[PDB]
């Protein structure tokens, strides 16, 4: 319990933490000074892209009762949010959109990673491309997505690498997308751009956000119909390509795994 010297401590720390805080910020500001606006200095961490799912699955599962309207309001909400973006109303004026090929077209590098030109043009995408996705209760619609990657040029497998059975062969410009779980208790349908079960190589390479605000990435509606309703089923979407890899630890590297159950 010391007195009269309290001001000696206070004044000390004040202008010590004060300068320590100065230096910590100082440096912070400088290392803020050697990284692009346009491109992350390191990307070797996201090497394999990751296939994410719109229906927000608590634990990779979509169990719900057809007989309840609210038994799947949760899966409805989030699937709503992802899609309110792709509105034909959000993207009307060629600024800054471009009605790309109604089908699987070819990619077109829009210059480089500079702000030397304007806002890099952004290919459109119609909510219509995703037929039958109410949403339906019988057989919920589940759309898939590919993770954004600056400079990523997906390269679909050559006609020489393909097994039983990802079809058709859209070697041109499209990333196949099959689904499975033995255990064949399903019936798979895919509502695509062109109708194909794959991504159009007309949307890459994605040019950052800072370079392409309002950019929009492809979608891939995939809902089943004839399925069990008294048991959980284990199905797994998977992407395919040279530029596509998977790991044992990450159960999301270019694939999902969904535990659907339409109990009622």
């Amino acid at each position: 319990r010391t007195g009269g010297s309290w001001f000696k401590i206070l004044l000390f720390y004040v202008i010590f933490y004060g300068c320590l805080a100065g230096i910590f910020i100082g440096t912070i500001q400088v290392m803020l000074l050697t990284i692009s606006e346009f491109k992350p200095t390191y990307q070797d961490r996201v090497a394999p892209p990751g296939l994410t799912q719109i229906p927000q699955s608590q634990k990779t599962e979509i169990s719900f009762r057809p007989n309840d309207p609210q038994s799947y309001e949760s899966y409805v909400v989030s699937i709503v949010r992802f899609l309110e973006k792709y509105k034909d109303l959000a993207q009307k004026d060629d600024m800054i959109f471009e009605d790309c090929g109604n089908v699987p077209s070819e990619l077109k590098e829009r210059g480089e990673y500079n702000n030397e030109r304007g806002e890099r043009k952004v290919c459109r995408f119609r909510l219509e491309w995703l037929g039958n996705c109410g949403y339906k209760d019988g057989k919920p619609c589940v759309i898939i997505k590919l993770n954004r990657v600056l400079g990523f040029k997906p390269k679909p497998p050559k006609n020489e690498s393909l097994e039983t059975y990802p079809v058709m062969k859209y070697n041109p410009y499209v990333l196949p997308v099959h689904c499975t779980g033995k255990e064949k208790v399903g019936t798979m349908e895919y509502f695509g751009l062109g109708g194909y079960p794959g991504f159009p190589l007309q949307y890459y390479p994605y040019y950052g956000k800072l370079l392409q605000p309002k950019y929009l990435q492809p979608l891939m509606a995939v809902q089943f119909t004839n399925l069990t309703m008294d048991t959980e089923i284990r199905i797994e979407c998977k992407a395919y390509g040279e530029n596509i890899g998977y790991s044992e630890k990450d159960r999301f590297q270019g694939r999902f795994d969904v535990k659907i159950e339409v109990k009622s």
């Binding site: 990307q43 070797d44 996201v46 090497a47 990657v149 400079g151």
Partner: protein, 31 residues
């Protein structure tokens, strides 16, 4: 493919220098 690191060579390159101080220090303790 500027999306690649030669991690395999820095792992092989650090493990070679942490095994050198491990033995340099064994030269100065056991003197």
């Amino acid at each position: 493919d500027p999306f690649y690191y030669d991690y395999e060579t820095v792992r092989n390159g650090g493990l070679i220098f942490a095994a050198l101080a491990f033995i340099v220090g064994l030269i100065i303790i056991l003197s």
